[PDB]
Design an enzyme around this catalytic site. Structure first.
Site, mmCIF file in Angstrom:
data_model
loop_
_atom_site.group_PDB
_atom_site.id
_atom_site.type_symbol
_atom_site.label_atom_id
_atom_site.label_comp_id
_atom_site.label_asym_id
_atom_site.label_seq_id
_atom_site.Cartn_x
_atom_site.Cartn_y
_atom_site.Cartn_z
ATOM 1 N N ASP A 10 38.027 29.077 45.276
ATOM 2 C CA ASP A 10 37.637 29.317 43.783
ATOM 3 C C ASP A 10 37.374 30.958 43.893
ATOM 4 O OD1 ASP A 10 37.686 26.823 42.943
ATOM 5 O OD2 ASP A 10 35.384 26.640 43.507
ATOM 6 N N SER A 11 37.945 31.657 44.539
ATOM 7 C CA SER A 11 38.072 32.956 44.627
ATOM 8 C C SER A 11 39.312 33.673 44.116
ATOM 9 C CB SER A 11 38.398 33.623 46.255
ATOM 10 O OG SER A 11 37.322 33.176 47.066
#
Ligand SMILES: [Mg+2]
Ligand SMILES: [Zn+2]
Ligand SMILES: [Zn+2]
Ligand SMILES: [Zn+2]
Ligand SMILES: [Zn+2]
Ligand SMILES: [Zn+2]
Ligand SMILES: [Zn+2]
Ligand SMILES: [Zn+2]
Lengths: 168, 98, 110, 53, 147, 56, 53, 279, 65, 45
Positions: E4-5
């Site tokens: 989720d970067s």
């Protein structure tokens, strides 16, 4: 529960953790502000008298510096307002507190921490910005995800507990 | 160089939340203590330290490191020196060591 | 950072738990505490013989705690007492005493 | 500044405004010139005055 | 980008993408206990004021306030307020030498910084002169910011 | 155990008074001074004890 | 003041730079994804006029 | 006996403690040689977080009320025990007196500052010898008036008299000897906006009656004859200068002033109309 | 607000196209895509700016200073 | 004295100390402090 089994302690930092594939497995990227805030008391020895002397001559403002000196009498002189005096020479038996440089193992933890793997030592790598950088091969025992998750970092203050912490 | 796989590319509506790093990062190295327990205070505005709870101590016992536990629960927090008596083990020993 | 002491330094081993005898309470205490007031009548210092007199411990750093001297970061504290004219019961023992009243005679005490 | 916009916001918008940059080769940098602050060798001074009529 | 970067364009950030303003309001109020002791908004002098904070007092005016537009940083006093003391009440340290008053100002947060946007002074319900301050700060999207 | 516990000792006769290091009072603004709850309880014990002695 | 785009994006004279090479895929640098056929889904670029399949 | 801890630098020893206090690090340090003077600093803000000496003094007390799981018989036995020990202290008069004074001040819609000043005045008087009675009504009315004069507030004698029947004369004597007590323990302009609020007049008539009140205070002649009549004739002139009609009967029955008095003052006031014009 | 300067991607100047844009909308009554086709915008990175702009300065100016 | 501004009518008062907090000509007690007369430097970054 709040004063014996557990307690709020010093020498720690809490912030958001994020990934960085360019780092190693055991390392952790520590921000410069945290490295300048926290400290570690090292013992003056003839092997690092010149290095610690350089750290004293650099000042607390610079990262490769120190914060406080402890004479053999058990007395602490702050580096701030000490430049007004002029010169501070170190001797054998003193304890100069330096900043967190590289190759410094510190404990890394993430609440609620239900594993013994959830608290593991790490090698400090000083990096800018403000987020703890680490490799993604360690997010599985921590049960973490890079979405606003904060972690805790504890620093040992003795050589014996640092070696025992690095060998265990 | 051209990428081998085509990329899903297009605009998308996004929002910025209240959570920011500038209101979360904090480090404490020897700060103010509470008046009751003489322990590090609670809160980032009061320059407070992190809590070493019970589960953390249990993990330190799981690793088998007793020296780091003793140092973390004494020098890193609060360490007091008192005098006890030989006949009775209570802290009634008046100490005028000047 | 505390002051050095010449007493022998040892670890804490056996811990014994027991009840406080009234004679030992009077032998440990230093003050009687008779005035229900907190501070002195002049709204300063301490009442001297009250709920928080210099015969006990003190805070505010500046005060010295008369009977230990030294400072608040060193003062373990000091104990007062209260001599009652009518004996009272302890909560955590109300049951136990009752059981004793059901285990011994109420006259010859056998 | 009496505008309803923020000051650093207006400074940002002014920062995004493009300017002419032809003979910029012979204009030295700020760090390269040995004067204090600025001089007719490093920078160009501009001004803005607006008032509702 | 893993876990989720997100990777954000720097040139878009420099042109003002997701940049927001934060307005922090510091409200202070002077009070009177038994009419004998009266808190007063004023600029504390470093000669007769005890318990004075180590922050700078050059940004304060004669009334003990910071005019809007002055760039302030952390550990800076925004509203200067002093409380009267009695000589025979404490006499702690140098209280028998300062004689006058005791500092009790409300400084800005330690980690905060920005430009004072607006300052207003008004009497409340019971007629006590209180003052509200509002400081603005542009928070450029950083790596640690969440989206 | 004779050296540690006694049924006579179970009945409270004299009461220990802990020092302020246990119940730290506060003097805020020199005019707003707060005392701990145990201090108020000791005041109640003193008023009830002196009252009982006066009535007896 | 003078500056390049590495200091801030406000010093950006150039805009969108259209970079392209090899119109008809013969160098085998991209494997086109297709649901039924790559010739019916992927359209032809303009530069294809300057070469040949 | 001494007990005064004074921090000094044994290395500097050149001047009394001219030190600096680092609260973030929790130390106090000499600002010369940079040597720390003390570690582990205590806080006063942190102990205050959990939580009146000016009035209650050093006296402590605790309430006894009913519990979550309890009987109503024990609640009555504990309250009756305190009812027998209530004679041990003569402080029952302060709580009841402050309760009734609280009811009167809450009935007069006065701010809390006048309430605290009146309570402080009654605490200064309390039970002295020069009071010698007054049946608790006159010391309360006079204490309210004193707390009104201290807080720069204006309340006429007929207002407190309308609240409490203190028979005026004994009220004046008790107020006089009370003022002597206050002197032993060591302004009509505010009335104008109040009566202008009673009549509902604009701000220009209020400040016009302010300038008229000050000027009439400077002109002399009659001097005052109590400031109330000067106020009502000043507002009467300032309202006869404009066009808002109230006449003399309505303003005389609302402000409780005699019509012959506002006309008697309106005569000489009309005689001094010359130098009273602001614009 | 009040017409974003440049663009948030390509970098082309668009602030001088708002007045004309509205002028083309209120005078010629053309569509949004046609007006954006007359201004010279050929990439949607710019198009999202003018198309998704919420001018709130007009509602800010109606307050007395 | 210091320059103050009224809430509603935005008039220049410039009242001194011991003058309470109230506008002249109108009864709005909200009094502005006005902005400083010195320059403030900003950066476009
Ligand atoms: Mg999470
Ligand atoms: Zn003993
Ligand atoms: Zn002691
Ligand atoms: Zn130059
Ligand atoms: Zn002696
Ligand atoms: Zn010194
Ligand atoms: Zn674009
Ligand atoms: Zn006005």
């Amino acid at each position: 529960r709040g004063n014996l089994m557990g307690k709020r302690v010093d020498f720690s930092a809490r912030t958001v953790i994020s990934g960085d594939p360019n780092l190693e497995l055991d390392q952790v990227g520590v921000p410069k502000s945290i490295a300048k805030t926290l400290t570690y008391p090292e013992v003056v020895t003839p092997y690092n008298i010149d290095r610690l002397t350089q750290l004293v001559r650099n000042g607390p403002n610079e990262h490769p510096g120190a914060k406080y000196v402890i004479r053999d009498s058990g007395d602490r002189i702050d580096l701030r307002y000490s430049k007004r005096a002029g010169d501070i020479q170190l001797q054998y038996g003193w304890k100069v507190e330096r900043h967190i440089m590289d190759n410094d193992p510190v404990l890394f933890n993430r609440q609620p921490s239900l594993h013994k793997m959830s608290m593991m030592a790490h090698r400090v790598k000083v990096i800018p910005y403000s987020t703890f950088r680490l490799n993604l091969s360690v997010t599985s025992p921590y049960n973490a995800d890079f979405d606003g998750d904060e972690m805790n970092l504890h620093v040992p203050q003795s050589e014996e507990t640092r070696a025992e912490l690095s060998q265990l | 160089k051209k990428l081998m796989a085509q990329i899903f590319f297009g605009p998308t509506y996004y929002q910025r939340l209240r959570h920011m790093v500038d209101d979360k990062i904090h480090a404490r190295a020897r700060g103010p203590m509470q008046v009751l327990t003489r322990q590090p205070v609670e809160g980032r505005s009061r320059d407070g330290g992190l809590r070493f709870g019970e589960m953390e101590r249990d993990c330190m016992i799981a690793h088998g490191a007793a020296s780091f536990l003793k140092e973390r629960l004494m020098e890193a927090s609060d360490a007091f020196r008192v005098h006890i008596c030989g006949i009775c083990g209570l802290m009634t020993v008046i100490a005028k060591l000047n | 950072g505390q002051q050095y002491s010449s007493a022998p330094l040892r670890t804490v081993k056996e811990v014994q738990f027991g009840l406080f005898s009234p004679e030992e309470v009077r032998a440990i205490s230093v003050a009687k505490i008779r005035f229900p007031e907190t501070m002195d009548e002049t709204q300063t210092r301490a009442k001297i013989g009250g709920l928080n007199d210099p015969r006990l411990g003190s805070i505010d750093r500046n005060l010295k705690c008369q009977t230990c001297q030294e400072g608040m970061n060193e003062c373990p504290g000091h104990f007062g007492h209260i001599d009652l004219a009518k004996p009272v019961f302890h909560v955590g023992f109300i049951a136990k005493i009752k059981k004793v009243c059901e285990c011994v005679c109420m006259h010859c005490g056998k | 500044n009496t505008t309803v916009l923020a000051d650093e916001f207006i400074a940002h918008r002014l920062g995004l405004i493009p300017l002419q940059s032809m003979d910029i080769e012979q204009l030295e940098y700020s760090r390269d010139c040995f004067c204090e602050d600025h001089c007719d060798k490093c920078s160009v001074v501009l001004t803005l005055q607006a008032f509702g009529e | 980008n893993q876990e989720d970067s997100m990777i954000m364009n720097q040139s878009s950030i420099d042109r003002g993408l997701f940049r927001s303003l934060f307005f922090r309001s510091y409200m202070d109020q002077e009070k009177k206990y038994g009419m004998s002791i009266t808190e007063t908004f004023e600029k504390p002098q470093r000669t007769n004021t005890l318990r004075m904070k180590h922050g700078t007092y050059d940004k304060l005016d004669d009334d003990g306030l910071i005019a809007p537009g002055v760039r302030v940083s952390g550990e800076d006093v925004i509203i200067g307020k002093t409380t009267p003391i009695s000589p025979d009440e404490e006499e702690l340290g140098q209280r028998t030498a300062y004689h006058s008053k005791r500092d009790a100002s409300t400084p800005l947060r330690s980690t905060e910084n920005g430009i004072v946007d607006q300052v207003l002074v008004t009497t409340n319900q019971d007629g006590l002169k209180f003052v509200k301050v509002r400081v603005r700060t542009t928070k450029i999207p950083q790596i640690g910011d969440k989206f | 155990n004779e050296v540690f516990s006694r049924p006579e000792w179970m009945i409270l006769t004299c009461l220990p008074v802990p020092p302020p290091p246990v119940r730290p009072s506060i003097s805020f603004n020199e005019s707003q001074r707060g005392e701990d709850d145990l201090t108020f309880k000791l005041a109640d014990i003193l008023k009830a004890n002196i009252s009982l002695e006066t009535l007896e | 003041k003078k500056g390049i785009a590495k200091e801030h994006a406000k010093w950006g004279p150039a805009a969108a730079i259209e970079f392209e090479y090899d119109p008809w895929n013969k160098l085998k640098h991209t494997d086109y994804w297709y649901e039924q056929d790559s010739a019916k889904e992927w359209p032809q670029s303009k530069n294809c006029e300057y070469e040949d399949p | 006996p001494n007990l005064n801890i004074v921090l000094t630098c044994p290395e500097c020893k050149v001047y009394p403690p001219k030190i600096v206090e680092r609260f973030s690090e929790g130390d106090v340090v000499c600002a010369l040689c940079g040597l720390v003077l003390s570690d582990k600093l205590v806080d006063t803000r942190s102990e205050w977080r959990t939580f009146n000496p000016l009035l209650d003094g050093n006296n402590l007390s605790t309430r006894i009320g009913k519990g979550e799981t309890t009987d109503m018989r024990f609640t009555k036995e504990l309250n009756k025990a305190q009812g027998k020990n209530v004679m041990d202290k003569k402080d029952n008069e302060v709580q009841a007196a402050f309760a009734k004074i609280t009811m009167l001040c809450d009935a007069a819609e006065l701010p809390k500052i006048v309430k605290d000043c009146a309570k402080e005045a009654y605490k200064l008087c309390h039970d002295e010898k020069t009071l010698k009675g007054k049946s608790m009504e006159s010391i309360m009315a006079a204490s309210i008036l004193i707390g009104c004069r201290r807080a720069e507030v204006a309340r006429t004698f007929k207002e407190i008299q309308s609240l409490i029947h203190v028979k005026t004369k004994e009220f004046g004597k008790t107020l006089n000897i009370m003022k002597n007590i206050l002197r032993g323990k060591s302004q009509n302009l505010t009335y104008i906006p109040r009566f202008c609020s009673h009549l509902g007049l604009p701000m220009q008539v209020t400040t016009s009656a302010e300038y008229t009140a000050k000027k009439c205070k400077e002109i002399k002649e009659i001097a005052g004859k109590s400031p109330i009549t000067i106020a009502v004739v000043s507002i009467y002139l300032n309202i006869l200068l404009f066009q808002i009609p109230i006449t003399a009967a309505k303003v005389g029955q609302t402000l409780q002033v005699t019509e012959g008095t506002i006309k008697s003052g309106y005569k000489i006031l009309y005689e001094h109309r010359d130098k009273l014009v602001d614009p | 607000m009040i017409v974003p300067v440049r663009c948030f991607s390509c970098g082309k100047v668009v602030g001088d196209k708002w007045e004309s844009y509205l002028n083309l909308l209120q005078e010629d009554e053309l569509d949004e895509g046609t007006a954006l086709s007359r201004l010279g915008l050929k990439r949607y990175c710019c198009r999202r700016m003018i198309l998704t702009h919420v001018d709130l300065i007009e509602k800010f100016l109606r307050y007395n200073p | 004295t210091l320059k103050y501004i009224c809430a509603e009518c935005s008039s220049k008062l410039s009242l001194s100390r011991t003058d309470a907090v109230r506008c002249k000509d109108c009864g709005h007690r909200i009094l502005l402090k006005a902005r400083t007369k010195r320059l403030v430097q900003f950066e476009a970054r």
